[PDB]
Amino acid sequence: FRKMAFPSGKVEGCMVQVTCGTTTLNGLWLDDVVYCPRHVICTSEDMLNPNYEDLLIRKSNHNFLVQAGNVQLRVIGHSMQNCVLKLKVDTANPKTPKYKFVRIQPGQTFSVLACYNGSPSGVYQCAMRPNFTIKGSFLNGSCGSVGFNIDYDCVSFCYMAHMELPTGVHAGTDLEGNFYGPFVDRQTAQAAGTDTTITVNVLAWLYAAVINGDRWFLNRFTTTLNDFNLVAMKYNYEPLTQDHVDILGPLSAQTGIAVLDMCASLKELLQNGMNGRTILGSALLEDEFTPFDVVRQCS
Amino acid sequence: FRKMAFPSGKVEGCMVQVTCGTTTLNGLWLDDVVYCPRHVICTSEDMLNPNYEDLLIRKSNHNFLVQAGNVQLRVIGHSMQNCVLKLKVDTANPKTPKYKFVRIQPGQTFSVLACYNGSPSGVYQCAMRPNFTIKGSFLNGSCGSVGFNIDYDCVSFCYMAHMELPTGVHAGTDLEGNFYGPFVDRQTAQAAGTDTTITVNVLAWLYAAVINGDRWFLNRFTTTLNDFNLVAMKYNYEPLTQDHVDILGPLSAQTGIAVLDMCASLKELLQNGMNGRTILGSALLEDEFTPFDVVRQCS
């Protein structure tokens, strides 16, 4: 069962390079505006306790060097929205796709175009962790890399990277400058809170194994939502809500397995173990597939 | 450690839909030639024992309908090279990237752009298994999907999918129509030989773990190349050759751990087992990262 990313062509046409002084990172060019992290007006000695509000007023438009491949963009205005910087240019991007800005919830999935230079270099599929961090790549320079979903022909941008934490994860904001989680863009000691497994996603991954003919883990028993969550808290699983149960309705119909029946299966795997056998080629339970992802891939 | 695919934009601009009678599948439009699997001239009847030379002789150019998005292309010639059909059109692809055709060997990695319609739908990173099959998509219609690498703005095409095997994996050809492995484009009882773990890739993935500060699996022992292969084959691992020892030279230099010392580490995980700990976030040893891949993401 391949974890697949969305094709990145529509986003590749929007990536630019933004340089201010000695620091360079990636920006997003849509219409006649370039979006990038605001801490580009900072150096390393400036990152300690910077006042972006006071620092930005001393900048001038030509202080910003923007290159779209081998062409230079003329900056004609600057402004700031939360933790995102907005550079206005004199030319609208002819490769601009149909797009919109959205904010996702913990547990939802999206694709990330990692640009560790100023030109794209790789793409991968990931999930927003309950502690609001993203694992992703480990080679940097990708500050300003973007995350997105695609629905037919419309790109929904949901994430832009700002910082890399000590454990290899990074943290960021939506495209309107609002951070995900309790992080800030300062040079302070920051650390991610303890993480948790995404219960509804693990259940959706078990429906996909049954659709692919992997049925050894099913049993005859059922459980209550209360009895299950008591199990969930002991193994560091997110509690299951009635909202999550409804989302799984379609897969329960297609397979003929009641949602609380699959919870019985999951209950035994956690309590008892996987006994050497594997589900879809993996000895661990996968939690980076949403219910929606499973149906999209299983028609 | 993200398994990353290459950005797919340059390949997306080359995907077309090819229809012949009742059969439709994906094609590759480069310059004024479209490449696709030759079994697009077959029915469900002809796939048992088709005579392609006889089926192609009965066709004329107007028998082939080629659609590039919202535009139909005019076919002005047809030809066959091994198991690949070549359609000549009167219009060159304006989005043709710098490209070339190559043939890979088992163990190498590449990206797959899955188009289960005539339009792209997902991208993923994979490795050619020692038994010559690919762990690919599971919803069909993707026949004619393409696999590629990108190095310095040049697209290297290495794979096109032709058939779906009974275990869910796919088999295919290079871009010159020659199959990988002992497979043919007939719908006869075919099966892949037993698979094996790609030893040299696992060793490169263990060097990457040491680069990220994960050293718990190391020990103070060394081994001979023969004693290692004696243990390795017992777990269905590929034998290690002196050429594979050389390939790992750079990574051993960067870390300061001799290749045969790392083989000792792997020997211990295999003989004794992993049990409860996980290495790079996996309770299984990973084999879809080549030495080349490791150096490109760990500098």
Author numbering:
A (entry chain A), B (entry chain B): 3 to 301
From the paper:
The main protease (Mpro; also known as Nsp5) of SARS-CoV-2 is one such protein essential to SARS-CoV-2 replication. Mpro is an obligate homodimeric cysteine protease which functions to cleave the viral polyproteins into their individual functional components necessary for viral replication. The active site is located at the interface between Domain I and Domain II, where H41 in Domain I and C145 in Domain II make up the catalytic dyad. Mpro is an obligate dimer because the N-terminus (also called the N-terminal finger) of the second protomer closes the active site of the first protomer.
Interestingly, despite the breakage of the disulfide bond, the active-site loop was not repositioned as the F140 side chain remained flipped in the outward position. This suggests that the disulfide bond stabilizes this inactive state but is not sufficient for generating this conformation. The disulfide bond is thus a consequence of placing the two cysteine residues in proximity following the displacement of the active-site loop. Our work, therefore, indicates that the loss of the π-stacking interaction between F140 and H163 is the source of the inactive conformation of Mpro. And (4), the reduced mutant structure shows that the disulfide bond between C145 and C117 helps to stabilize the inactive conformation when F140 is in the outward position.
